[PDB]
Every structure is written in structure tokens, then in C-alpha cells.
RNA sequence: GACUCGGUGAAAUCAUAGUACCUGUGAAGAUGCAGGUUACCCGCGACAGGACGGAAAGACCCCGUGGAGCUUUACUGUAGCC
RNA sequence: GACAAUGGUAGGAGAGCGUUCUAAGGGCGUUGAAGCAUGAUCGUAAGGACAUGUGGAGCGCUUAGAAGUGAGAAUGCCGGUG
RNA sequence: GAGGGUAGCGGAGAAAUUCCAAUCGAACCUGGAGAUAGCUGGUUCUCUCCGAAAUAGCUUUAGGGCUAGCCUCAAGUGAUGA
RNA sequence: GAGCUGUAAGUAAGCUUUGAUCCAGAGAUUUCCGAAUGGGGAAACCCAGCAUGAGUUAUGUCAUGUUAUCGAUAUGUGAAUACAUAGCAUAUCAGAAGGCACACCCGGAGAACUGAAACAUCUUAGUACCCGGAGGAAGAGAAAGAAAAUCGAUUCCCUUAGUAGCGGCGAGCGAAACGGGAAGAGCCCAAACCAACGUUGGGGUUGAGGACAGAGUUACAAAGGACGACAUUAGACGAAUCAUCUGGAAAGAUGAAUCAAAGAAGGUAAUAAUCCUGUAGUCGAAAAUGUUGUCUCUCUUAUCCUGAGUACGACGGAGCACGUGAAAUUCCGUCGGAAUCUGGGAGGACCAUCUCCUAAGGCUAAAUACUCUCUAGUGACCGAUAGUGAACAGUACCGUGAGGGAAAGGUGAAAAGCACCCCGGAAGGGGAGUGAAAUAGAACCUGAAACCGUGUGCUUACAAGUAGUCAGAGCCCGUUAAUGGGUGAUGGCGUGCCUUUUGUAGAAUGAACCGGCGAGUUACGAUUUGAUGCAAGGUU
């Protein structure tokens, strides 16, 4: 309340929407996967397990933040250009699952 | 365990060490009345009157048939009737 | 170790004597008490749990 | 009879009813006619008319 | 009635009070401050100038986006009538 | 040891006093507790002791914990008495 | 005079806002209920350090409020202050 | 298992070991009013009719039974009116009535102050109040569901989440599904079609099914028994301490012992594990209520149909978190009004496809809600202005009435409650006694302050004052022994406190005085800081 004068957020504008069909991914970056050892595959189940990942969401993505330094067969729902490159460039593979 | 007749000793107040036969007993008070124990001197309007009052119960305890002794009371079932036991030899009252 | 009746129930009228079994440690008890007089196998169970 | 609003143009409610259309009406009841009230949709949804 | 005596015996009020006047000063009208002036201690009957005396959180006046009763071609409704 | 600072309303910050209850520890008490009264006592303050008298059965201290925790004003409420 | 009737969004009124159980522009009792009160009053121990404002803007706003200004506490920066 | 005739004294008369008073179960009696019910009535009263029976020559009077209204059942009399029906009598039954803690629950009906800094939509709130209906719970409940990989009745708790959304898009209002838990349970009809007289039995109960071609009195059907066991409603047993000291009294102090499945707690002349009542433990029921078992006991082994004035629609409303909105979903009034497994409904307007389901019949325990009650217990809850309004009361008192509504606890261990003497009519005192103590003497523990008195060490009748403070002789005392205490001639300075104000000695506010009571609290969220643990993890 400001006394009579017209608050804040009635002169201001109201703006956009919620998408009802929003997804929004657990997201995993490369640092994060220097966690495991050369030859790993990784699996959404096994990112649960040793506690990369707490909460699933709408699924799995993996980001190029961070260095790799590891071989890994990485799957998950969805990875960015860069983590993809990173992680085959690295000697590993990834695959959409 | 305590009745009227029985021979009791005071083990608590003026007469403490005193002994005197029961006159009588009042169970709503727990009390007692002993003869010539606790004397109160009364004025009486028609003298002065010389009479016991009643002491608590728990200050008198009874004394052992066998050896003398102020002893506690248990309770045992000859003959079907209850009968009163001393505690410190464990005969009959 | 466990619940011992006979134990407890001898030790239960003493004052300042309290029986516990292992997974009845409290701080108010150990704190409160001045000596702990443990079984070896409620001691070694302690070092289970507690680690 | 049933309770509900009355709601104006700037939607000030006032309570009102809503009443059944009775008709009072000639009906057997037990086997002995009688006047009765009877409302239009069960006379027209066969009481029985006497 | 008041007044004196015998009997009985309230009340409103009340920060504590050993509670003077003048001219001044001051929230601009002072028992209580200044400078003077006057005044031995304690009652009783009287008078009403002051204690902005008592009494009722001013009725006047203004203010509150307070209340209530009343009016109407104020607004929105509505019993009822067509 | 030698320099500096320390008027203060609204208000901010800090450190403490005291009251009742609880826990643990350690104590006092019919050879007289609490309370009450008096005194020429002690601490920078809130406040703390001691002695005597009264009283006649409970009560301090230490550390920590918890609050119905401190009154002089509300034309405050109740009681007592002017 | 006796026995009765009319009841508060109502009665009654030879009409005065008149009467309805000692104050009627809408009785009394209980409840919603600790209505709401931007108003008045009140708000209880101590010491230590700092210490304002009574201005601007907007406000059915003008003895209210909000943001800024001015106070305080704590972290930072570091010459940017006088 | 010895006292007893309530509280409750006091005498009087009695009762009780041939078992009283008392306690528990079961019975008997149970005046009148009150729904109140034979009629009436200003409750606790008045007046009656029938039948039976005392009594009286007879009447008067008396005792028992019965007689309300609306309802059920079945016998008559029976209108306008032919028959009948309505109506009127009788006989039998006893179904309803009213009350509550009616707290919790379901339903009908339903505000306003308030918030929005005005106010009307909205909010307060489907809340208060009123009305109806019940139960130990109620309500809901066995998918025309949730959904989008599938689940599988209902309810409740956590979370989702102050999210999605609703909203003069203001103030505010505000889900659900998923996931995690408590609990867990499923069934009966209508209809197709058979066999007996449309009504009865069989048939059947669904997401495709049906027709056709061992279970139970907790739903799923309802009555008993036999016996057992357990629980509640009285009770019983139950270990162990003596001495001295101070004291009126010992449980305290000291010494030396003892018991403990018992060192909970009360009481006892001060503070007791061993004095008492008890406690740990153990035992106990003639009778009545309950719970629960085994045996018994019975019950049982796509031709057709599938809920119609329905679904649904229009209008007007309401309930859904959702204010008519793109508003699905549910309900009410008015009016219209389908289809029939090649069917019907839902998946948030709607269409198509797909997916799920199968309305218009009913029943159903448990997990949940509450406390006037009862039993057993608990408290960093009160301790007599507190705690219930009420420790001795819905009383006294106030009001026509609805209704409002207090004040008031404490002798002592034991009444030992003051024999007797003296003044006094008494009241009240002084002695003497009781008592540890009577300034513990009932108006009784302690006994503060205001306030009222008596005595007097210093001082005061020439003095102008917020009463003190600083200086200071004189006089009187002598301490928590301190460069002391009381008083005070006389001199200097000096207009109370609070509140509110630019500014108050203010002639602005408030307080007669004293005492008690009397105001930033708690819960749930947010944020920030300090502390602590762990750390790419932390935490339930
Ligand atoms: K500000
Ligand atoms: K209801
Ligand atoms: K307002
Ligand atoms: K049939
Ligand atoms: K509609
Ligand atoms: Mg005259
Ligand atoms: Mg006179
Ligand atoms: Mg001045
Ligand atoms: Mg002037
Ligand atoms: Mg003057
Ligand atoms: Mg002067
Ligand atoms: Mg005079
Ligand atoms: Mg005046
Ligand atoms: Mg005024
Ligand atoms: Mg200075
Ligand atoms: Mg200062
Ligand atoms: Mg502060
Ligand atoms: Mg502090
Ligand atoms: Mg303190
Ligand atoms: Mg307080
Ligand atoms: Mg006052
Ligand atoms: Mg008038
Ligand atoms: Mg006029
Ligand atoms: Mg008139
Ligand atoms: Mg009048
Ligand atoms: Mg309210
Ligand atoms: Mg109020
Ligand atoms: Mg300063
Ligand atoms: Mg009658
Ligand atoms: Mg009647
Ligand atoms: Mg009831
Ligand atoms: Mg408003
Ligand atoms: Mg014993
Ligand atoms: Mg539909
Ligand atoms: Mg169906
Ligand atoms: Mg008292
Ligand atoms: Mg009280
Ligand atoms: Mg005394
Ligand atoms: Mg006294
Ligand atoms: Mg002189
Ligand atoms: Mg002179
Ligand atoms: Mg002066
Ligand atoms: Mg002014
Ligand atoms: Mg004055
Ligand atoms: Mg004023
Ligand atoms: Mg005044
Ligand atoms: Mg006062
Ligand atoms: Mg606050």
C-alpha cells in the first residue's frame, strides 16, 4: 500500500502465460560426469544412484559446462551440441534414449 | 490390628515409651485411646477434670506375646478365620 | 544388549542406578549418570549402530 | 419449493424461490378420489387423473 | 431554619501544601517566578472578588474517506402493481 | 602508560539487576525457613548482605532452561481508609 | 375499576418525533463480539554508546500513509569526504 | 469384622460378634407435577364418567382399574344416493409425542458489523443465529472414475502448493491428479426367461454380463442354544529400625542396623523406604453386565434383457477454488425431450479419432470427528483480587420478564474452646487456668501500607513558604565504628509528577491516599543475523 497512490503493480503491466505442457530436465554437465570411471555407460537410473541427479523432471539432459576427461557411453533424453561433441570427441559415445 | 483391650506401646509423643491398655478406638479419626496416656485437664462447668484424649493410631504398636518387643502385625488364616500374627516371632495375638 | 527384566528389575529401587538397553541411550541419561557400566555385548552393538 | 438469487444487472443478489406449477387435481389415492395439488410435469409424466 | 448546648451524624471535592498584596514576567489574565510592600500563633459568626471554583472527556464551531433519522428528477436495488 | 571521548527527546545498539517455575550439583532450617519490622552496611545502577525483634515451616546458592517477569498515572478495576 | 387485544423492518398516536416499564429519529435482553475506531488515553527494572525529524514527491490527501531525505547496527570498499 | 443411628454436634432412646453401620451385584417400594394423555388449569391443583370393592338403612364420602390425540388391526352402524363411499360406534394393540453436552454429524433456511483504507460486484461466509433428523459416530463408498504408463470402492493424514487457477485480475479466494501413509471388503435387487395363483416364488447382477443356445447375524439371509475363557462392577495378602540429643512433639542431628520385583504417594505433634494407609508383586466373585472362542445351529454347496418423462437441451438460479467466462463437470424450478451393444457417457467449449468407463435401484464395517460423562493417570498449569461465576453459587441481590449476577478459605498437634475469683445489667475486661505459644480466645496463622491515637528528645507564636537542597551554630544521643545518629537558630539556591505540545509552574490533561490486579504474547509462514552439523550436496 502506498497511501492512495496507485501501487506499483497495478501501473505496471501484466505479461506472458504458463505453458500448461512445460518440461523441464534434470540437467547434467560434464564436470559432473567426471565423476565415473573410463568405460562407464551411464543411465538416468544409474545418475539417481550414485546422486548426480536428485529429482528426475521430465527427463535427462546432459550440458557442456565443464571438462570431460573421461570415456563414457552416456544415454539420456536429451544433450546439448556441445555436450555431444565433448563426449564423443573424448573417446565415448552418447545416445538419445 | 490395633483393639480395644489390647496392650499397646506409645512409640511417639509425650508418653513415648509409656504402655497402657487400649480404651477404645475411632476408625473415621485413626485414632486411639489409652489408658492413662495423654491426659488433658479439662475445665468442666457444672473443675477441673483430668481425662485421656486420643492419640493417632500409627503412634501405638503392639507388643510381642514371646519376647516382649513392639512388633508389626501380619495376618494369616487358621482354621479359615483370619487371625493376627507378630511379626517379630510370628505367633498368634 | 536387549530389555533384561531380572536385570532391571533388580536394579530399578536403587537410587541413582538407571538400566538402559543399547538402543536406549540417551544424552540426559549418559550426561546425568557419573559411571556407565556396559556388557560387552551391549558395547560392541553400540559401536554397531553409532559407528 | 426451492431457495436461490435474484441477480440484478450490477449483480446485487436478492433470495428468492422457485416454486413448482401445482394444480390442484381430481386423483385416486388408496382407491377413494381426492382433491389434490399435482404439479404439471408429473401430471403431464404419468398421477392419475379421476 | 441559621446561631449555643446534649444525642446522632453524611456529601460533592481533594498532586503534596507552612496557600498575602502591588507592579512586572511568563503558554501573552500568577498564592507558588522577579523586585518591592505588608503581615505575631489558633479559633467562631458572616460575604462571595479569586482559586480561569465544583458539576457533565463542549451541545456551538471544525475535523473523521465516524454513525443515525429524513428527502429527492443522486446511484444501485427491491416489496408490489401492470 | 599516554592520548582521546562520555548533555540528550523520538529512536537504533550493547551490557546487566531483580521476580516465579524447572533440571543438575551443592547447602541451610524448630539450636527457628519464608514473610514482616528496624538499623549508622555493601555495589557504578537496577539491587546484595549482616544483626536484632516478630514469625512458626519451609528456603537459599551455582550453572543452565522457561516465562502470567518488574506500575505512579489509563475520569483504570476491586478492597481498605481519609 | 376489573378482565382482555395490538410488539420493534413493529405497534399506538384529536399529530408533540408522541408513547410502548423513571433518557425512544426507532424499546429491552442475549448472541455475531475482543464489530470497527487513520481518534484520545495508557504501556511497569537499570546503566552504557550513538542520536534524529517536523522536509520533497504522490495520495478522496491534508493531525493518516508510502518512497526519498535525516538516525542506528553490521559487513565491505578505500581517497572517493571536509 | 467392631462399631453404628447422614452432614453434625447435642442429649434421648436404641441397634450390633445369633455379625450391625459400611461396600458391590441383583430385586422390592418408588407420593405429586412435568410430553402429561379422563376434563380443566394461573406446574406440583381443581372437577369427573364408567367397572369392581370397603362402608352406610340410604345418600354423602372412600379404594383399585380405566377413560387424550393422531396411528395401526378387525367387527358392526352406516349419508346426501342405487350399490358403495365418507362418516359414526366397538374391540385389541401400543406405533408417535417430550428431553438432551443434543459437543461431534447430516439436511432446510441464512445475516450484519467487518475487509476492500469510501462502496455497490466481491469479502466477512455458507460463518452466527433459527428449524428438522439421527448415531456412537455421521457423511461417503464399490467407477457412465483417475488418467495417457497404466491404475483399480470410500474416507482420513503427509505432500503437491499458496502451485494451477479464480478475481471491480482489486481486497482477497484457492484446488485436484500423481507420489508417500492409516485402514481395507465387498455385495443385494429391476429386466430377459421358467412354474404356480398382474402377484408370487425360482433366474440374475455386468464393461461386456446374463437370459437363451463353505457362509453367517458388522453389509453380503435370520433366530436361537451348550460350554469355555477373558474383562468390568466389592475386596485380600503384602519386606524391613532401634538408640541418644534438641525439643511440646522427631520423621530432623548423631550412632548403629534392616528390606527392596516395594526409595510412587499421602498421613502421623518438625523433614520417615523399615509407625500408619499404602507401593512392587500376588490372589479373589455369589450375582449382573460385556468381549471373545469351540461345538451346535441353520443358509448353502447379440435372438432377448441390462434402471424414461430419464439422460439431454433452452431460460432463470445454485454448487463446483473457479464471479458466465472459450466453462467442461453436478444440482433445482419452468418448458421441451433421446438412443437401446452397430447402444450410451467421459477425457475442461466443440468436431473427428483414440482411450477409459457403463448413469438414470439399493446396502455396506475400518482408518476420521467430538467430551456433559465414567475409570486410571499426567503437568518447568492456578494457589483464594489467582484458578471455574462458584475451594464456603447460578445462591444472595437486581429486573414485570427474557436476563444479569456477587462477596465469602486458614485457632490449635490435640478442644485440651478459658473451672474458679473480681468490676460490670449486659457487652467487655483483670486475674487464675489449658496450651510450646492466647497480641493462637473463635471477627482466632502471618498481620504490610494508608488512616487513628498515647508518651516525648530537639524545635516553633515579627513570619511570605513546590517544603527540599547546600552551608551551619546550639541542644540531645551513641552506631553494621563509620572523617557517627536525631533535631535544628540562621544564610545561599529553588514554580511537583505524568501526558501532550512550537512552547506547560501552568489558570491544558490525569491522579483523595494506600494496597493488590492491570498492556508487544503465542501458533503457523517469510526474511535477516548469530550459532551448530554436514557439504555438491543438505534435509526428511
Ligand atoms: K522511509
Ligand atoms: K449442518
Ligand atoms: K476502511
Ligand atoms: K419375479
Ligand atoms: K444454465
Ligand atoms: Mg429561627
Ligand atoms: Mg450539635
Ligand atoms: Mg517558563
Ligand atoms: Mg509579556
Ligand atoms: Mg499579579
Ligand atoms: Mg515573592
Ligand atoms: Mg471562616
Ligand atoms: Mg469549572
Ligand atoms: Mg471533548
Ligand atoms: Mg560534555
Ligand atoms: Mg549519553
Ligand atoms: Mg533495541
Ligand atoms: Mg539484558
Ligand atoms: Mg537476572
Ligand atoms: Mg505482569
Ligand atoms: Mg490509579
Ligand atoms: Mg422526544
Ligand atoms: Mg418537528
Ligand atoms: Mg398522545
Ligand atoms: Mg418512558
Ligand atoms: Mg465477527
Ligand atoms: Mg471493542
Ligand atoms: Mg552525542
Ligand atoms: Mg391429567
Ligand atoms: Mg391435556
Ligand atoms: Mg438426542
Ligand atoms: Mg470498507
Ligand atoms: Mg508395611
Ligand atoms: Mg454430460
Ligand atoms: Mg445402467
Ligand atoms: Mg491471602
Ligand atoms: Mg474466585
Ligand atoms: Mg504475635
Ligand atoms: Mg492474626
Ligand atoms: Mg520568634
Ligand atoms: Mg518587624
Ligand atoms: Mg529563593
Ligand atoms: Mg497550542
Ligand atoms: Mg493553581
Ligand atoms: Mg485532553
Ligand atoms: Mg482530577
Ligand atoms: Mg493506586
Ligand atoms: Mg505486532
Redesign the pocket.
Known sequence: ?????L?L??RLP?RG??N?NRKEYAIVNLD?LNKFEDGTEVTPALLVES?VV?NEKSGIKILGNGSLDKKLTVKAHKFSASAAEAIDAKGGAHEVI | ?I??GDNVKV??????GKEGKVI??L??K?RVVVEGV?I??????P??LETE???????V?LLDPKTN??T????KFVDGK?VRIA?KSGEEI | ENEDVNVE??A????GVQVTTAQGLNVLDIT?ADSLVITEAAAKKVEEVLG | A???????????????R????LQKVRILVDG?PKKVWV???AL??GVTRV
Open positions: 500500500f502506498e497511501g492512495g497512490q501501487p503493480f497495478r501484466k502465460f504458463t500448461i559432473q546422486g536428485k | 490390628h483393639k480395644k512409640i511417639a509423643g509425650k508418653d513415648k477404645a478406638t476408625p473415621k485413626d495423654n488433658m485437664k479439662k475445665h468442666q462447668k473443675g477441673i484424649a486420643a492419640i493417632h493410631v500409627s503412634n504398636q518387643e513392639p508389626r502385625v501380619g495376618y483370619k511379626k | 528389575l533388580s530399578r529401587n536403587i537410587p546425568n | 426451492s431457495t436461490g438469487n435474484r441477480r440484478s444487472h450490477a449483480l446485487n443478489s436478492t433470495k428468492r422457485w416454486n413448482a406449477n377413494k404439479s404439471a410435469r403431464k409424466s
